[PDB]
Structures are given as C-alpha cells and as structure tokens.
C-alpha cells in the first residue's frame with residue numbers, strides 16, 4: 001500500500017497468534033513492542049529516544065506479520081509508549097519513503 | 100526521491116538561515132530541532148516518546164526547505180538527541196510510506 005502521513009501510520013501486526021496495533025516508524029532503528037511473552041532466550045539492549053534511554057529485552061528470529069506481510073526478525077520488548085515497527089522490519093517488508 | 104531504510108533516512112534541511120542534518124521520522128507527530136534561534140513568538144510544550152518527556156519551545160509558521168521542497172509549519176526547539184522532521188512537515192513535501 002501507499003500510506004500518507006496526515007494521521008499516525010498505525011497498522012495491524014500479528015505476533016504470537018495475536019493482533020496488535022503498531023506504528024510504522026522510520027526514526028526507529030529497531031522494533032519495540034509492549035510487555036508480552038516471546039519464546040526463546042533474550043539478551044539485554046539499551047535504546048535511546050526523545051526522553052532518554054530505556055532497557056529492553058532483545059528476542060531474535062521472531063515471526064511477525066505487518067499488515068499481512070510476513071517477516072522474521074529481531075523484536076525488542078519493553079516499556080515503550082507505543083508499539084513501534086522500526087527499520088529492521090520495514091526493510092524486510094520492502095518499505096521505502098517516497099516524495 | 101525514493102529513500103530506502105537500510106540506514107537512517109538523514110536529509111539536509113534549511114531552517115532559520117542554517118543548514119542542519121535531520122531524520123525523516125514517521126513516528127514523530129511534530130518536528131523538533133536542537134537548540135537554535137527562531138523568529139517570532141513561542142509557547143512551551145512537553146513532548147514524549149521512549150524514555151519519557153522533554154520540554155521544548157513551540158514556534159509556529161516557520162519556513163523550511165527539504166531537498167528542494169519548501170514547506171511551512173510548526174517547529175519545536177529543545178534538547179532533542181537527534182534533529183527530527185515529523186509528520187507535520189512530511190505531509191507538506193508529499194512524503195509517503197510505500198510497500
């Protein structure tokens with residue numbers, strides 16, 4: 001699809017068999033989702049945003065669908081204000097900025 | 100142009116007679132620039148994201164140029180770690196997400 005930016009670019013994602021809302025976020029290097037269960041081992045990561053830094057859990061090779069497009073990649077879990085789909089997964093689904 | 104997301108989508112902007120590098124950020128409602136002087140009145144504002152909130156000064160009706168595209172809109176000035184072009188200016192240059 002072509003998504004304009006007059007409103008927040010909110011989309012539906014599927015992760016762990018569940019539907020969630022997330023923001024397509026070109027300013028995010030990585031993808032961050034609110035507290036939830038994911039399988040496997042995790043490693044620590046720090047990420048810095050407009051207000052400072054937060055600690056998150058990094059899960060690798062996670063199955064995720066973004067507006068029906070299938071991706072498999074890294075997903076961070078932590079106290080993010082909103083679920084964010086960052087460049088690591090935007091590149092997987094072939095998303096570009098255009099003007 | 101068409102801008103891929105393998106790297107951070109950084110562009111050169113002209114604002115207040117100055118050249119700055121900034122991030123094309125679909126996750127930001129508004130545009131925020133590191134400390135600089137801008138003409139006219141301003142109002143204080145709090146903006147929030149990962150890691151919480153920062154206080155900025157809101158300047159309205161500020162002219163900017165991004166890759167040959169002039170626009171006008173609100174610009175926030177404050178202690179942002181990265182200069183960010185948000186949706187309020189991205190719309191005006193006709194920027195979209197496509198996949």
Ligand SMILES: Cc1cccc(C)c1OCC(=O)N[C@@H](Cc1ccccc1)[C@H](O)C(=O)N1CSC(C)(C)[C@H]1C(=O)N[C@H]1c2ccccc2C[C@H]1O
Pocket residue numbers: 023025026027028029030031032047048049050051081082084086124125126127128129130131146147148149180181183185
């Ligand atoms: C995930 C990650 C991993 C590794 C490295 C980096 C840089 C990562 O990205 C971190 C990040 O937070 N990224 C931010 C942008 C960013 C990058 C670097 C430093 C600081 C911030 C993300 O894109 C984003 O905007 N966001 C994120 S939360 C949000 C959707 C509310 C939005 C935001 O702040 N929006 C608020 C905002 C921002 C600017 C102006 C106005 C407003 C109002 C509100 O809408």
